[PDB]
A paper describes a structure:
To obtain direct evidence for the allosteric binding of purine nucleotides to the CBS domain of TbGMPR, we attempted crystallization, with or without purine nucleotides, of the inactive mutant TbGMPR C318A, in which the catalytic residue Cys3186 was replaced by an alanine. We obtained the crystal without ligand (C318A apo) and successfully determined the structure, at 2.80-Å resolution, of a GMPR harboring a CBS domain. A monomer of C318A apo comprised two domains: the catalytic domain (Ser2–Phe97 and Arg226–Gly484) and the CBS domain (Leu98–Ser225). The former displayed a typical TIM-barrel fold with accessory α-helices and antiparallel β-sheets, whereas the latter had a tandem repeat of α–β–β–α folds characteristic to all CBS domains known to date. The interactions between the adjacent subunits in the tetramer involved a large number of hydrogen bonds and hydrophobic interactions, whereas the formation of the octamer was stabilized by a hydrogen bond and 14 C–C contacts between the CBS domains of subunit A in tetramer 1 and subunit A′ in tetramer 2, and equivalent interactions between subunit B and B′, C and C′, and D and D′. However, no interaction was observed between the catalytic domains, indicating that the CBS domain is essential for the formation of the TbGMPR octamer. Thus, it appears that GMP induces the transformation of TbGMPR from a “relaxed” (C318A apo) to a “twisted” form (C318A/GMP). However, the relative orientation of these domains was obviously different between C318A/GMP and C318A apo: the CBS domain is rotated ~40° between these two structures, a change that may be induced by an interaction between the base moiety of GMP and Arg93. Two of the three conformations were the crystal structures of C318A apo and C318A/GMP that represent the relaxed and the twisted octamers, respectively; the third conformation was a tetramer structure generated by dividing the C318A/GMP octamer in half.
Numbering used by the authors:
A (entry chain B), B (entry chain B): 3 to 387, 394 to 398, 431 to 482
C (entry chain A), D (entry chain A): 3 to 402, 431 to 483
The structure:
Amino acid sequence: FNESASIPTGLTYDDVLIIPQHSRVTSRKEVNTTTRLSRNVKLSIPIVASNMDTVCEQRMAVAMAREGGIGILHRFCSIEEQCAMLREVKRAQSFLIESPRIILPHETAREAWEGLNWKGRVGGVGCLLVVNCKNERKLLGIITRHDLKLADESTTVESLMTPVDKMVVSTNTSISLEEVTHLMRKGRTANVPIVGQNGQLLYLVTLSDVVKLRKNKQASLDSRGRLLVGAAVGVKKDDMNRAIRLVEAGADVLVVDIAHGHSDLCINMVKRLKGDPRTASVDIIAGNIASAEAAEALIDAGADGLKIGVGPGSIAITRLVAGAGVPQLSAVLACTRVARRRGVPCIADGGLRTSGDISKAIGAGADTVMLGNMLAGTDEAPGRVKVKIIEGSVACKGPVGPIVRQLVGGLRSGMSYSGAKSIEEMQRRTRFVRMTGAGLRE
Amino acid sequence: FNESASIPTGLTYDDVLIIPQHSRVTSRKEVNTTTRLSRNVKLSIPIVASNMDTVCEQRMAVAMAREGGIGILHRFCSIEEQCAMLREVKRAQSFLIESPRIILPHETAREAWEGLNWKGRVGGVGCLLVVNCKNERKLLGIITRHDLKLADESTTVESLMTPVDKMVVSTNTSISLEEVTHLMRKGRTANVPIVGQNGQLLYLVTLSDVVKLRKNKQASLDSRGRLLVGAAVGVKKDDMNRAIRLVEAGADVLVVDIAHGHSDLCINMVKRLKGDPRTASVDIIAGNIASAEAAEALIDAGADGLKIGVGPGSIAITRLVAGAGVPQLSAVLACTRVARRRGVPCIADGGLRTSGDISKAIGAGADTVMLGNMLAGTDEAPGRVKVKIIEGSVACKGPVGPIVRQLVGGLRSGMSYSGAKSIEEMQRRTRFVRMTGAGLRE
Amino acid sequence: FNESASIPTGLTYDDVLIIPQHSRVTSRKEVNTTTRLSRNVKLSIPIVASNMDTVCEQRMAVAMAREGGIGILHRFCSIEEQCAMLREVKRAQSFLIESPRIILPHETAREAWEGLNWKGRVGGVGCLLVVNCKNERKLLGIITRHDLKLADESTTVESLMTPVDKMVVSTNTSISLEEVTHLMRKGRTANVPIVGQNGQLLYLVTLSDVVKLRKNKQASLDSRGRLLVGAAVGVKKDDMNRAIRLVEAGADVLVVDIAHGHSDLCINMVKRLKGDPRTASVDIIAGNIASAEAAEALIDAGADGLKIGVGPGSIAITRLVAGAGVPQLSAVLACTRVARRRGVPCIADGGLRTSGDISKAIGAGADTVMLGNMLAGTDEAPGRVLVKDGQKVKIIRGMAEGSVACKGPVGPIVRQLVGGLRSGMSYSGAKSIEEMQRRTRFVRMTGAGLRES
Amino acid sequence: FNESASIPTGLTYDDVLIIPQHSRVTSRKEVNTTTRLSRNVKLSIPIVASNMDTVCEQRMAVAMAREGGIGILHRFCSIEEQCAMLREVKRAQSFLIESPRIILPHETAREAWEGLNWKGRVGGVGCLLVVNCKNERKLLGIITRHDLKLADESTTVESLMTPVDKMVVSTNTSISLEEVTHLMRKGRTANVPIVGQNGQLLYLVTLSDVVKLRKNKQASLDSRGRLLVGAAVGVKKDDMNRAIRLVEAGADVLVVDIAHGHSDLCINMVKRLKGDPRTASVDIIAGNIASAEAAEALIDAGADGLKIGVGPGSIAITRLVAGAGVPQLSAVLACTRVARRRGVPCIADGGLRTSGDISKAIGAGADTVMLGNMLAGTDEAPGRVLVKDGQKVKIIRGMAEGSVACKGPVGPIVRQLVGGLRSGMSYSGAKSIEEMQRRTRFVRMTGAGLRES
């Protein structure tokens, strides 16, 4: 039986462990996790939310950008709708509020407390702006939840409100975040409305937003201050149309995502996207591939990022229907040896379950990971809501935020076992060891 | 422990995956799946229905021939009965209908609707031929289901019927399919009865059959236009008698099927079958074998097709009772290296569960696959009927048709991962990679 | 402990069986099941589709009236929604199809299979009328699934169609069912389009609709030949609005439906509706009640039918939350004694689980039964069909959300229940619904005797 | 077999339903539920927190009196423990906070988030008063969670605080709720500290406490504005000690609580307490009973309320160990006939599982119901909360140990039960608790009829 032993043994994440190396690290938080998503796109955490229609739309995209990562919006929708999602991601970081909740001076405390829990936002609005007329919108005062805790249901909103003269107002529609933070701190207030010279209520700035924006400090932003976001396209005819309309809406990178990335359809597409001037303005990521040969071919075809993995995913029907694939650790080992030498970063899409699995991916040479099942069912994932249902039905996992922080925590910890202080070090310094059948079960 | 490491490691389908290779394919349907069942028997799809008494009798045999494959009728029955099955398979493609459902002009609409759902065919008959007398059978008219939807239960069939003069009739018992299709199209009708010069109702041709015959266009046919079909025989004394009576009935190939194909009983039999002139008119397939040595021996013994697999089947009691066998991927790898060089095609009988498993078999060198559990319980498999019971009891799987189409779809897709555009390419171009324990469980 | 000995014992359907009596019935369908829903509404079968939002909307009320009973549209919905529902019902016996599936001469046989199987109706359409322009709409021909069975996907429609000169046509937008039946026979065709003096496509009449209206000969109809359907209101100031518009929508009866009908709220609602001309034109059914006294009270208020049952509803939660009710069989025995002496029909609402339960309800005095649980989850019941684990279910979003198991179509179910009931009448020696009411005799079971069934 | 035919049949809550009667009620909250716990104690809602060690201690008795009923502190504890509990209850309506969370000018914003979220109370505190020394305690300012939202962890408190000259202050340690309400309005602040003539921090009053006392307008109060709470004793020589100290602790009623109250032990206990001035100053509730005779016996002994139920308690094991009891509904029907003819209220203790059960109990004659099982495992019930398998439970160590399933907060539960009961009153045609008692009519169910609910 000769032919039956030429066949190499491929390894997946669960086949190996990170051998512990000497660590000079002397600080729980001194490891740096900055990486590169593609050739000209750095990320502060190396986590990418997957372009699966059960994972990443606007909410997911915004959340991960803010945690310092990024999501790639799926393509299983219209072109218009995909850019609809995209255009919303770019507005997400605005601390200005058009159309804030208004109220008239002669309504009662019962109505004030009605409008404070309007079905518009979760938790309600934090205040109401007291205006003279719902079409004029001249600022007369402000009313918070506090101002109503001691008044009768049928009491004049005009009496409880803080009057506009006693308010901190601003007439500068292009006001900084630094300056509005100053006005909030200087006036011991949490609401700075923005008024025209006339007196009109143009915008509202509230301290919730100012706090949430000073918080997410590792956030991955573009040049114009908006949140980074990627979009996924196919290889068909109408897919070049989709790719133009997506860079219009504001895509920062485009990901071409076919099942078999080592194809002519993909190579041709990458060459196309990097060729036309309407789309070469953003980095072009290609996948999925699993061989070293595939890697050279796609970098050659002009690609700025590779996505690694032909069939290892939570929904890799590929191996049951086609019987194709590569165990994902080998696929990363083989594909990063090529793409590293050509300065091309790689996403390790597929097959990740633990944070420890993420250290394994990075140490095998990956620059980022694409997360699948691990994010489906989180608040910001799509699907009605304890369980979430989009067809599909996954249990609720909570907010994406603290799930990715513990995830980065694990990698940070995994890096320390490799004695690495940076993502590049993690890639170069990690040495693996295989386990057997009985080896995983402990 | 020296002797305990000379022993080679054998691989089964679930041990390996198809590594993805560059695919120049630029069309979802451009891969060709034609193959060869034996030396002088081509098939359009490489799927063979197994000679198990729970899988392939006349219904199964006809279905798979029509999908462009073939079944091999089992031998666990009489000789007469086996050719009974066979003689029926060869009549299956006739678009002529002897003894069509007749009715007399003076019966009522209630009786007309009775005879339309006679317990003879599923869904009923599509029409009734109105004749003057049940022994004479002179054509007076035709009555469809439509003609009765507006008539009272006790109404004259003679009034509702379309009269024979207003019908499209033909007097040509040897009429083409092309010509009868023309008469149906030219007369906007779906029934063309065939009458003697006298006036008698000899045959009926109906559009259901004409449609179903223009549909199954990849159908595997013999020279005389009948559907291909194979038969299985043993190696005993009465088995040579069975083999003569089977080529009489119309067998296109004979399969000798012993548990241990690498025997003298089999070699002797193959030599016998290829020797006698009553049986050398059809190709002779031999099995089952699992070693390269076995392959040479049986081609030498005059065989035109090899069946690969000593004990990997869904009911391979072989390994528990005798402890013999070979992991089926190695068995195919080793046995096709020999039989390819001698232009002899191989069936990869045993152990297939997914379509992906089928790509694996083809890529390991097989020319066709023999399907077992995957077809038991389909409509056209034997056994009363939700579950089917023949003793045995399997759940109902539906119609064989759409199960084999998705199956060929998977192989077609599996081929694309190998970068193959034809069965030969799939065999030559596929390169495998092994998975470990943890490697299959993702 | 005497205070506890003067509490009477109420009985429910599982406490009794019908004592068999001498049956002079031979022909198992010389048994009449017609009855009255209210004073001025007769039904062919005594089944009613309960006004629950998991049971009766457009499609259930249609099915139920075609089978010979009636459905009561629920009110857990806006007024506009309840009247829209009622309006769909009131036009489902029309055999004139407005705007039927068109197609133009130069499209392909591929473009035609696409048009025929598109789910315009549940299943699809059976022909496409061939016009020259989707606006002018002059009729040139007709194409049916059969014209396509022998052409490549690339063949034009003009190629395979039957031209208009060889179809049967009419210009009488007011054509009688007879008349069109006639043209379909005489011309041996299944489609008669109705065209304008010009030649434009105005309407299409298909054989299938003609064959429906010729079948369901038991269908519950109003004077204009439309399906009977009721609608439900409550007892708030706005339910008067709701009623008014439901009548203008064409409701045939209103059912005032509160969980405690023996109340001034309920009475005053019934008196309102009777005293307004915009609603007094239709029968007023009031409930729910469960004493003789309540019956007498709502009949005095004006009610044209009573709905019986405080408590026994399947997904009724009255018993647990409030601890109030009356076992249903006792309830029906008490109220209908009152209601028969004044000519007011009763609906026995709640707790029915088998046709034998329906037998017991009618035997105990009732004219009609309301079925919620037994009908929910059918084809024609509301809620979307979704597959899980090789089994089908229905999901009904927004309620008074949950998943009931798919029961198939309601027509066969309703026809067994009527058969079951006809069978039970034969045990009572009853050739009519009224006979069932007067003749039935009950015997009580202990818990043991229930296990024996 | 005659000896077995003269045994009467007692009924329990599942044997009956309330027969609906004519309801003249329109406004679903023109239904009064106030009632009497004993001769000289009225409650707004007829619910009582049973004196079981898995149900009523400090936090349950507070919640129950704020909701408008009362809790009975259990005695499975030392005397000191029972009086400590009662004392915590008697001071939970005080809006003066003694020793509130301090902090000194030179600490960090990190040192302040630490102080605000520390679980002084369940949730934390809302401000930290800024004093210069943890001993002298002169007030300099106030810091709230909002003052911190825009400063690095390393910023001083003096930096972000509001200085005392810009706060609203008072020096009246006797300030009225009105007065402080007034300063909170007029100064648009949520905190009014009370300081000394010097400037030391004496007390702090927060808006939240002011908003509580302005809400719970139904709270059960004593003459000094404190929550009503009862406490339980037994019938041993030392229970006299226990009672004496429980009264000096401020108990509002005592509940003598043995499993067989129709006994000289029980009677003699009731007579004792009435004849000692150190305890006769509060109402004496005696139980448990279950016959008319026992009622008459304890009323004669002096009892100001009776507790009904020998047996039906959830974790009562009387029936199995002793084989004694009376079905609860029969028990209540028997005793309250006696008790109404003498002006003594009754508590129906034991066996309640739904609001409809509460409806049946009041309808059968009772003035108040005791709930053990239904309240155990709530937020305010005793026992520690621990998580297992994605579900929360409570563990109550040392008993009369086990794990009950977390039910949430008791206020919503108590408010449904009252709603449920109000609903049941509407079936009885009852606009008051007494009306419920006089008007309710029962009907019996067989086992079958119970399944139908």
